[PDB]
Design a protein around this nucleic acid. Structure first.
Ligand SMILES: [Mg+2]
Length: 61
DNA sequence: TTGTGTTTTATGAGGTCC
DNA sequence: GGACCTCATAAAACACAA
């Protein structure tokens, strides 16, 4: 497949800041995050998908 | 500092949207 | 005629009882 590479403190800080601002990434913010973090647009899109799955688990009960 | 449950990336199947 | 997300899933890495 492709062996996963965990994101740095600096990369996660940027992703969580945007996620806190909006649960859904805009095309414009995805490019900004891509430039800031060196993650691909694809990675940023997937991380948002995964973050909403995590937030959904937090609505346990 | 072992072990092995949870959390974090990453994928592909199957959906919505004129 | 493509871009987008939710879902179940797998595996690498983490967190921390033991
Ligand atoms: Mg849907």
């Amino acid at each position: 497949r492709k062996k996963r590479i965990p994101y740095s403190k600096g990369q996660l800080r940027e992703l969580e800041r945007e996620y806190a601002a909006n649960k859904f990434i805009t095309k414009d913010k995805r490019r900004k995050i891509s430039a800031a973090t060196s993650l691909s647009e694809r990675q940023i899109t997937i991380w948002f998908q995964n973050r909403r799955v995590k937030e959904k688990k937090v609505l346990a009960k």
